């Protein structure tokens, strides 16, 4: 076990670090990285795979096809690229693209990621919540995965270790890397926020990959804090604060 | 890119010639033809020559030895020989062979050939199915290969830049030879015939080359539809169709 506590100021949470070379775990709060959740806007990532995979996009360019729906997120109100769709957590682009997978093709690529308890039952999602087709079974819905799954699965995608193209793991890469305003650090990354209402708990969420110097290291911060303002963005935050803190570069450093 | 969807009749599917003349291939339906299956029966063809390379068949005529097992295909209820356990598709002459070579040597043999995914970890094959011995790893199981790649493997063996004795690439032309009713042309192939459980699709192939007054094209006939009935034989047919409209001239 180790300490992080002083970067999550009070907010509810936990940490899991993966290095590749010392196949050594960091685990801050072991019972919560063990505890399976929603996986919200995380689930991007592998959604993003699966559309490369089965020719439903294909380039950081690609689009779905927007019907001139008002959102409350202006970004959403466009006929908008995969790049954007992600980086924004847009659900219509990606609610529309995974509509257009199979469900047996979804349920054989996470049973061969060990995707949590691989649970696609509520398709749709929670339609008893009022927001109609911004739903699906990722969002607050049938299909959970815990932190420590989380980063086992990114393990396995990102050192060529499935059997998604490299040159999709690639496209998957250039969109999930973060502006940290350090370019001695390259971070990766994806936000999640969902509230789980059984629980009265927010399921915040930062899950991505820190590439320093030669080392690299698969990570996942979550928190599970009351407090309905924690979102992943506020997730984001403590997770680039630890890697400053416990992960820094020696080769470059500030002065 | 060319296309040969009507030959096809709507069944889902792709077909490679290649052309070692110019170096050109004819391609219909890339994403396809560049994806790695299951080469099922057409691994016959690799087969026969590491079963003659390693001495455990010599001939045409070569026997395995019959067990009287009695299987659902009739065409398989004797002491066949390598020329009809060829024709008939026969899996237990073919297992039976390939159990007497090492793993490292047929190892070694597909890596040098660059036979697709050379993947033979799943010796037995895909035991799930029920079927017992009639199985392998190139029966819908560990061995996966494209049709460019099959298209590829047939031009390095009969061009004569792999390892292989040219007398044994002689006995394998001979018993590939098939009757398309037309003397100006001699056509070779090996069927396929496989269901992909997981994703729900056949993997149903011809696979061989033509040869038309000095013109020799390697060629891959694959199908993936959803349909069980679409099987080698079928692609075989729609082969032969292709080569009538496109190759006879």
Same mark, same amino acid.
């Given at each position: 076990?180790?300490? #992080?506590?002083?970067?999550? $100021?009070?907010?509810?949470?936990?940490?899991?670090? #993966?290095?590749?070379?010392?196949k050594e775990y960091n685990i801050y709060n072991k019972e919560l990285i063990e505890t399976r959740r929603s996986p919200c806007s995380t689930f991007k990532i592998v959604s993003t795979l699966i559309g490369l995979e089965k020719g439903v996009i294909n380039s950081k360019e690609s689009v779905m096809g927007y019907d001139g729906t008002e959102y409350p997120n202006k970004n959403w109100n466009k006929n908008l690229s995969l790049?954007?769709?992600?980086? $924004?957590?847009?659900?219509? #682009?990606?609610?529309?693209?995974?509509? *257009?997978?199979?469900?047996?093709?979804?349920?054989?690529?996470?049973?061969?990621? *060990?995707?949590?308890?691989?649970?696609? !039952?509520?398709?749709?999602?929670?339609?008893?919540?009022?927001?109609?087709?911004?739903?699906?079974?990722?969002? $607050? !819905?049938?299909?959970?995965? !815990?932190?420590?799954?989380?980063?086992?699965?990114?393990?396995?995608?990102? $050192?060529?270790?499935?059997?998604?193209?490299?040159?999709?793991?690639? =496209?998957?890469?250039?969109?999930? *890397?973060?502006?940290?305003?350090?370019?001695?650090?390259?971070?990766?990354?994806?936000?999640?926020?969902?509230?789980?209402? *059984?629980?009265?708990?927010?399921?915040?969420?930062?899950?991505?990959?820190?590439?320093?110097?030669?080392?690299?290291?698969?990570?996942?911060?979550?928190?599970?804090?009351?407090?309905?303002?924690?979102?992943?963005?506020?997730?984001?935050?403590?997770?680039?604060?630890? =890697?400053?803190?416990?992960?820094?570069?020696?080769?470059?450093?500030?002065?």
């Open positions: 076990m180790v300490d #992080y506590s002083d970067c999550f $100021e009070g907010i509810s949470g936990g940490a899991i670090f #993966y290095n590749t070379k010392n790049e954007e769709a992600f980086k $924004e957590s847009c659900v219509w #682009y990606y609610k529309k693209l995974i509509d *257009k997978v199979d469900a047996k093709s979804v349920q054989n690529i996470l049973d061969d990621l *060990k995707y949590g308890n691989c649970d696609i !039952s509520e398709w749709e999602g929670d339609l008893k919540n009022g927001k109609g087709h911004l739903n699906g079974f990722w969002l $607050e !819905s049938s299909l959970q995965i !815990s932190p420590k799954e989380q980063v086992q699965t990114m393990a396995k995608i990102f $050192e060529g270790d499935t059997n998604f193209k490299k040159e999709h793991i690639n =496209i998957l890469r250039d969109i999930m *890397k973060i502006d940290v305003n350090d370019k001695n650090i390259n971070v990766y990354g994806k936000t999640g926020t969902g509230f789980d209402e *059984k629980n009265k708990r927010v399921d915040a969420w930062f899950v991505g990959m820190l590439e320093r110097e030669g080392d690299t290291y698969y990570f996942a911060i979550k928190s599970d804090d009351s407090n309905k303002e924690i979102t992943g963005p506020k997730v984001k935050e403590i997770a680039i604060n630890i =890697i400053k803190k416990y992960y820094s570069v020696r080769e470059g450093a500030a002065l």
